[PDB]
Amino acid sequence: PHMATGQDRVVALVDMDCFFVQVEQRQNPHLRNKPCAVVQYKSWKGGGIIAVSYEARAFGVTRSMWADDAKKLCPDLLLAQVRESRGKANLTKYREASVEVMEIMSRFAVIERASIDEAYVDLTSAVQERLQKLQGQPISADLLPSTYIEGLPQGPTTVQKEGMRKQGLFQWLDSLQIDNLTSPDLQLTVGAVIVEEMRAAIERETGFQCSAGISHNKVLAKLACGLNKPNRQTLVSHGSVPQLFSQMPIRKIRSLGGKLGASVIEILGIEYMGELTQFTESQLQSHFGEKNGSWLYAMCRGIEHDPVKPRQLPKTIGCSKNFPGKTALATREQVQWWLLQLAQELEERLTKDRNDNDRVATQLVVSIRVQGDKRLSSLRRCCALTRYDAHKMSHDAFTVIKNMNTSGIQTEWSPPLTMLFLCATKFSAS
DNA sequence: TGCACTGT
DNA sequence: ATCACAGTGCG
Ligand SMILES: Nc1ncnc2c1ncn2[C@H]1C[C@H](O)[C@@H](COP(=O)(O)NP(=O)(O)OP(=O)(O)O)O1
Numbered sequence: 181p182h183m184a185t186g187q188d189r190v191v192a193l194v195d196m197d198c199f200f201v202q203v204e205q206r207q208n209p210h211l212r213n214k215p216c217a218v219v220q221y222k223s224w225k226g227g228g229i230i231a232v233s234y235e236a237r238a239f240g241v242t243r244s245m246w247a248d249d250a251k252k253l254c255p256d257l258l259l260a261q262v263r264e265s266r267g268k269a270n271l272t273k274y275r276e277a278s279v280e281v282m283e284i285m286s287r288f289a290v291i292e293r294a295s296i297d298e299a300y301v302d303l304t305s306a307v308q309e310r311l312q313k314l315q316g317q318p319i320s321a322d323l324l325p326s327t328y329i330e331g332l333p334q335g336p337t338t339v340q341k342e343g344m345r346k347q348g349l350f351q352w353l354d355s356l357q358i359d360n361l362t363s364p365d366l367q368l369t370v371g372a373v374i375v376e377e378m379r380a381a382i383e384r385e386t387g388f389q390c391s392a393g394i395s396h397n398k399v400l401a402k403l404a405c406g407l408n409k410p411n412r413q414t415l416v417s418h419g420s421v422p423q424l425f426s427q428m429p430i431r432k433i434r435s436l437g438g439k440l441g442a443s444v445i446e447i448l449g450i451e452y453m454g455e456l457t458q459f460t461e462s463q464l465q466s467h468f469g470e471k472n473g474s475w476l477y478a479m480c481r482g483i484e485h486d487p488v489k490p491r492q493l494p495k496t497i498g499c500s501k502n503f504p505g506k507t508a509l510a511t512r513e514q515v516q517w518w519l520l521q522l523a524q525e526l527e528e529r530l531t532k533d534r535n536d537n538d539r540v541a542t543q544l545v546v547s548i549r550v551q552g553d554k555r556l557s558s559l560r561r562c563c564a565l566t567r568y569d570a571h572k573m574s575h576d577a578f579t580v581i582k583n584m585n586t587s588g589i590q591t592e593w594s595p596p597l598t599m600l601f602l603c604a605t606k607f608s609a610s
Numbered sequence: 611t612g613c614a615c616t617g618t
Numbered sequence: 619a620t621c622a623c624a625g626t627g628c629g
């Protein structure tokens with residue numbers, strides 16, 4: 181009677197299907213419905229792949245592949261390459277396309293921009309509004325034309341995917357308690373209806389397709405989204421969690437894909453998320469800390485309270501470039517010119533941001549990597565950002581890293597710099 | 611504050 | 619020779 185079940189919210193996670201590919205496919209119809217990928221640069225092995233159409237994924241093409249190697253799996257692979265500006269890749273087209281989608285989503289509910297192509301949605305309020313709009317009318321299956329119900333169909337009493345989807349949807353609806361407006365299952369269902377409408381508005385108004393997950397928290401919504409990609413949405417009810425987690429690898433839950441998740445596996449000697457239920461909260465806290473332990477004890481039961489943050493804009497605006505192998509920057513003149521290229525794109529983006537969103541960045545973060553450093557960043561320094569001036573930002577950034585040159589020869593730079601990073605942070609209203 | 615960690 | 623980003627938590 182007093183055991184909480186984590187069914188107080190309706191949360192959704194929307195994620196664009198092969199987003200960068202869709203952006204290029206909208207612009208160039210010749211790429212539509214083909215095996216294609218978006219590539220970065222072209223000189224080193226045809227460029228690095230950062231996005232792959234589902235037609236190409238069937239040949240085994242993946243993100244991070246070199247295009248020359250992808251061509252070995254998919255000889256007819258088509259390629260759109262990222263725009264290059266001031267010597268570097270420039271992602272403006274995709275950031276702007278992202279804004280298109282985010283603004284549409286914001287018409288239905290407050291969203292948390294989680295990445296360039298996905299956003300969390302708190303639908304608890306909209307669900308209640310819709311629950312009263314209908315005078316206890318049953319939810320027709322025609323309002324959920326692309327929804328999957330995780331765990332269904334099941335039980336006693338065809339062999340195509342869409343047939344299965346309908347089967348599971350019918351079982352779900354036929355047992356829904358439509359008279360109880362407080363039923364969590366009914367609230368998820370209404371949430372799914374709204375997400376159907378949200379995804380329809382996105383495709384109508386931008387041409388982009390997406391998938392979504394609907395559940396009671398962000399981790400389940402995220403996990404649900406990926407169960408039936410692309411162009412489908414999945415509803416993960418509280419009751420579906422025991423079976424879903426019983427065979428769910430720990431690394432699949434958000435925040436457990438790295439070192440922490442591996443230590444959970446190595447220390448506890450378990451494989452699946454569900455196995456965590458057999459440990460006490462104090463046990464999990466003793467191994468992984470007070471916060472992580474409490475989070476794991478609740479999460480393996482499908483409970484999580486991370487709120488959907490009202491944040492439609494990114495908190496930072498950054499610009500970087502790697503200088504691999506022999507292209508490392510070994511002269512103060514080289515560092516001077518590239519710091520200026522970055523500063524110029526940053527000024528461009530910062531001026532636009534200030535005009536569009538009534539805010540100004542107040543701190544400039546400068547980071548570099550040094551050739552041979554095992555880590556991806558070696559130094560991070562911040563300085564005041566008093567003016568949107570590329571030459572000042574680039575001059576200041578040089579000043580804050582300058583002390584890092586171990587070459588008495590003023591013109592030389594050692595060790596060579598393999599990365600430059602400028603980031604505008606600490607925004608204030610303007 | 612600077613970095614490790616986690617993610618797209 | 620992945621690369622270009624972006625958010626969170628620790629001491
Ligand atoms: N490591 C990386 N480097 C550069 N760009 C990247 C990247 N990872 C992602 N992007 C860019 C490229 C992506 O288009 C976009 C969204 O990332 P996802 O949602 O993780 N992958 P997608 O949406 O393409 O396919 P689907 O969602 O259907 O699985 O961010």
Ligand SMILES: [Mg+2]
Binds near residue numbers: 195196197198199297
């Ligand atoms: Mg995506």
Ligand SMILES: [Mg+2]
Binds near residue numbers: 618
């Ligand atoms: Mg995504």
